[PDB]
């Protein structure tokens, strides 16, 4: 019942709009891999667009002023916070159903990630525009853990290739098995074809 969303290749706003609706409808969502998110427009434009956000502090006391979070997960958590009525109870009750992370933590790397193609970069952009990786943008603003996550995410990659190689083999037999029991699943494969399941 837990939407696990992969941020690799998702546009920031188009994804945050879809996430914010589901969170408002009692759906517990986790947006994994926030550094793969990419904003439209060229990189130097987006950096300026974020540097002007760093310049808006309360003049008399910056300690109360707008908290410019630098981590990509908290940047994406910030833009979702914009699209929710976070002043009311149902808004604050919503945001607790949202949990964002950089990289893929242990409670989620062994689960299947979803993809929202209505917010996908390959879909929603003409293949001539430029886009800014949220990871690179956040690092050049103060996210001081880009190097760490780049190895922790790389670590769980090769730990997943092991599982995948042990999964193709775990089904290459299954393809080879039916070729070895063909005569005794013949009466169960024809019914699995006349009702459009194995054709």
């Amino acid at each position: 019942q837990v939407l696990v969303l992969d941020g690799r290749g998702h546009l920031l706003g188009r994804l945050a709009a879809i996430v914010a609706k589901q969170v408002l409808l009692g759906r517990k969502v986790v947006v994994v891999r926030c550094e793969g998110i990419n904003i439209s427009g060229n990189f130097y434009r987006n950096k300026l667009k974020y540097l002007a956000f760093l310049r808006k502090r309360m003049n008399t006391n910056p300690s109360r002023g707008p908290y410019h979070f630098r981590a990509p997960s908290r940047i994406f958590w910030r833009t979702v916070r914009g699209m929710l009525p976070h002043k009311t109870k149902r808004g604050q009750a919503a945001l607790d159903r949202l949990k964002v992370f950089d990289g893929i933590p242990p409670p989620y790397d062994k689960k299947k990630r979803m993809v929202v193609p209505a917010a996908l970069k390959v879909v929603r952009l003409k293949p001539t525009r430029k886009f800014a990786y949220l990871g690179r943008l956040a690092h050049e603003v103060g996210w001081k853990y880009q190097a760490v996550t780049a190895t922790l995410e790389e670590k769980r990659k090769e730990k997943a290739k092991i599982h995948y190689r042990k999964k193709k083999q775990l089904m290459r037999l299954r393809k080879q098995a039916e070729k070895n029991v063909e005569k005794k699943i013949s009466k169960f494969t024809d019914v699995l074809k006349t009702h459009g399941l194995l054709v």
């Binding site: 299954r174 699995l192 399941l197």
Partner: protein
């Protein structure tokens, strides 16, 4: 690189619109994003359909670029698209998507029990292939 070219006489499927699920042949290209199309032996009147609402296949049939329905029909039946089409892996998994869509509830039960026993013979067999895989490795 590209394999399917929008050119005169390529058979195409149809995604949406009132002509969905039928084949239709491209007579001539009108605009950048709209083509004149005609499936004579498919209950599709000659008309113009934009490229959004069509998925071009890998069938080609030759005829001049602005012939009338009389000549296309003789070129549709010469290459005999209909029989070849229904023998493709595309149309086979198209007529299998509708065989699951009209599945009655009792048919849904006959396919439940049929699936249950076919997931017990395959599963036990692959279990036999595992106790023999470390046997041949140890």
């Amino acid at each position: 690189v590209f394999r399917r070219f929008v050119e005169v006489g390529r058979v195409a499927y149809v995604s949406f619109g009132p002509h969905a699920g039928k084949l239709v042949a491209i007579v001539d290209v009108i605009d950048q994003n709209r083509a004149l199309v005609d499936g004579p032996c498919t209950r599709v009147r000659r008309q113009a359909m934009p490229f959004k609402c069509m998925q071009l296949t890998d069938f080609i049939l030759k005829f001049p670029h602005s012939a009338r329905q009389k000549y296309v029909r003789k070129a549709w039946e010469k290459a005999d698209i209909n029989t070849k089409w229904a023998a493709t892996r595309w149309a086979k998994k198209i007529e299998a998507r509708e065989r699951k869509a009209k599945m009655t509830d009792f048919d849904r039960y006959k396919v439940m029990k049929a699936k249950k026993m076919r997931n017990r013979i395959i599963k036990n067999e692959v279990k036999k292939l595992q106790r023999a895989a470390l046997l041949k490795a140890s």
